[PDB]
From a paper:
The mammalian SLC13 proteins are members of the larger divalent-anion sodium symporter ([name]) family. [name] proteins typically have a molecular weight of 45–65 kDa and form obligate homodimers. Each protomer consists of a scaffold and a transport domain. Structural information, along with cross-linking and computer modeling, indicates that [name] proteins operate in an elevator-type transport mechanism (Reyes et al., 2009; Drew and Boudker, 2016; Garaeva and Slotboom, 2020).
To obtain the structure of a [name] protein in a substrate-free, Na+-bound state, we purified [name] in 100 mM Na+, but in the absence of a substrate, for single-particle cryo-electron microscopy (cryo-EM). In a parallel approach, we used amphipol polymer to preserve the transporter protein, which allowed data collection on particularly thin ice to maximize signal-to-noise. This [name] structure in amphipol, without Fab, was determined to 3.16 Å resolution. The two cryo-EM structures of [name] are in a substrate-free, inward-facing (Ci-Na+) state and provide an opportunity to describe the conformational changes that occur upon substrate release. The Ci-Na+ [name] structures are very similar to each other, with an r.m.s.d of 0.75 Å. Comparison of the previous Ci-Na+-S and amphipol preserved Ci-Na+ [name] structures also revealed prominent changes on the periplasmic surface. The loop connecting HPoutb and TM10a, from Ala395 to Pro400, has moved on the periplasmic surface. The C-terminus of HPoutb also unwinds by one turn (Val392 – Glu394) in the amphipol structure. As a result, the conserved salt bridge between Glu394 with Lys337 of H9b from the scaffold domain breaks, and Phe396 moves away from its contact with H9c. Finally, the side chain of Trp461 is inserted between TM6, TM10a and TM11, packing against another conserved aromatic residue, Phe220.
Residue numbers in the entry:
A (entry chain C), B (entry chain A): 18 to 462
Write the structure that this text describes.
Amino acid sequence: LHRNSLIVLADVALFLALYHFLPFEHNVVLGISMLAFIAVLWLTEALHVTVTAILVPVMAVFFGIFETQAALNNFANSIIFLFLGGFALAAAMHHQGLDKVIADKVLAMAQGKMSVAVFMLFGVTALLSMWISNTATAAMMLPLVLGVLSKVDADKQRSTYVFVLLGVAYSASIGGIATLVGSPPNAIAAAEVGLSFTDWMKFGLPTAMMMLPMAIAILYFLLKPTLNGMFELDRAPVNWDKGKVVTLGIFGLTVFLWIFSSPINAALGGFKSFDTLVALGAILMLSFARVVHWKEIQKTADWGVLLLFGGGLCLSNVLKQTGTSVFLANALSDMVSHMGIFVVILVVATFVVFLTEFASNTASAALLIPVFATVAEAFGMSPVLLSVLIAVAASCAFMLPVATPPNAIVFASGHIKQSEMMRVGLYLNIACIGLLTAIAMLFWQ
Amino acid sequence: LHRNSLIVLADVALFLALYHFLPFEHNVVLGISMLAFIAVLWLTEALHVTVTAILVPVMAVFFGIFETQAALNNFANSIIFLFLGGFALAAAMHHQGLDKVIADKVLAMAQGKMSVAVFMLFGVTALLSMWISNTATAAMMLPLVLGVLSKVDADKQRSTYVFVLLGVAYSASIGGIATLVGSPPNAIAAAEVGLSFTDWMKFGLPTAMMMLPMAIAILYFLLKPTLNGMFELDRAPVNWDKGKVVTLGIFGLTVFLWIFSSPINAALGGFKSFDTLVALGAILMLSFARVVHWKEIQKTADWGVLLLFGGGLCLSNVLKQTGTSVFLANALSDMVSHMGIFVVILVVATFVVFLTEFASNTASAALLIPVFATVAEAFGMSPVLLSVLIAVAASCAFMLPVATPPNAIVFASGHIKQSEMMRVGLYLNIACIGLLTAIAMLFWQ
């Protein structure tokens, strides 16, 4: 009937074809066919990506790969509860008005001028997206930006609007690249290659600090805003109070425990996933301090993502179990050896940067990381490099707003020409490809 | 500071005392102390029961019982995803207006009279609570009941209001006793003793069909309503349409697969948790049919419960690992042998029926089932009997509304005297104790 309902049927037909017409052994054919099915379903977004994540275990069981519980156990990877603690921190610092207070105090650092306010705004937006999200952050900042522009004389001056808006969106999508929380794809990568919070900050904080000013400069040089007015702000200059102090303290304590996870856990007994224990402890300290109630943590969090992680991990453990990964590596050895690694990561990064502009970041990541990682390539291991690269690229969505929630949230204003966004995102995607290639070549090797 | 924040500290002090002043071996002392801590936290409801469920794994790890992942894996017991499919069915049959249509078509079965409408109402409320919930069901039926009574002449006639209302509440709480879904405690019991959907219906459907008419009769004989008026109904006589037909069909197919799980799964390969695969398949069929979107399944479901299941299961696996269960059985052997099993289940059932009137059903169940089951008693195994008994009793909340969501949802009307509810619930709780004792003695043995 509907378009998606026919995409699903075509995908079933393709699955059956590959299940009947492949000259590989049964198990590898099964893995490949499941992979194609799941990819066609995640990219097209026919079924809500979470539903496909839930179908992966069923597709694995009905075909005798996994036992039911051994497949559903992947919906409980410690990384998921780490992300849950992150969502709880977000719910706290939104219910207690902490983010508004931070952004406002920053807007005061700039007395009344714009030339410095939008830059501080991008910076704070990224600092938030480090923890909260990519969507809620943009939604929280949008009214602030509009109140800022309230005295811009928005007539034949749409350029400054587009600047102050796309800067916010991209700053969020980029601050999502600094922490394991902030953007799902980072957590998918870590779960696949076993990375810790700080072991991923060492990859994502420099990358973001490099990609954010590059983006602001590219925008300022593509569109030419004036940025010379003043601030006729009239909202309440909110102040600190109990509940925000405690929330900030617990937030800082959680971050301090995360960053220093290794020495602490080494001086405590050597727990396995100390970061996740720290996140659950953040939840416990926020509850014991009466600063946030579970109903908020439940309305706020996005559990579809917490099921998508499990789906991606079940897919990875499938490709690992049925031996499909080693076969794909044996098959791609020739192509990876003929050319170099630099061109390999170049094509990978461009593919992913131009894919998530049509698909969802989390789905593309969950689908691609397992392959390029579980391959265990021959000419060069680089098993974490590519995972981090893809997780970063999947967040580099800068073209049309259907690619990322924040882009649409900011496009809803009604004065962002699609063509300007598209060309700016093209320039930015090329720049990000180049930058990621450079970093992967120099730093991460 | 606050009452709950001091309860927590007293509980920590008690935990430390038992951790320092018990003449049992270290591990059993640890288990007992964790048990006391968690019980004091779940009964008092200081921290949202979900938060205590989340604290159980941390409390188990920081004290070296479990590895982190081996403890968090219990948040993915197939029973949880079964309950998730149940929540999805509820979201479908609420978003597609199926429940309203069913209740209205039933209200038409009674032409315009009341003497038969309230009984059909209790019946349909139970039939719904079989699947949807105990709370949403009462909330969905309340406006219908008020529109029914709109022509009751509710002056010196509060008796019929209380009847048509408490009947609804108790019918929901009892229909929650027929299926694994419908009430969490049933799922906790099954997870503890490995019960299937039908293997638990064989316990819960007769029990509910017996306890519901008993309750209606007790009410009719305590308070004396008239039940003689007509129906001046004026709402829209809704009709069927596409979306409701498909939803009903998928619902019936899911139920037919659940009930006949054994022969099917035996003629298919012998999967381990076929019921859970069937629930996930229900989600998949509801999504593929474009009848419900994940956002509704996420707003609707109660994930706190899906974490509470994991908390209770981690507690059970703790008491099993540290050897506390066998020790408690060795200690209670004398008391269980001196008296009989009949008196044992009698005291158990009364304790639980009068406990959940102050605590939450799910928490009391999650706390008590592990003990009385993992004991593996000496004089008589009865390892599933007591689990089912406690799961049924925990739903038998009939006194003051703070015990159960539905009771408060119906008390909000503003014309339900606390004393009448309390005495009616006392009578009903005694009757339910007697009935459960009788059934456990005759049928389940």
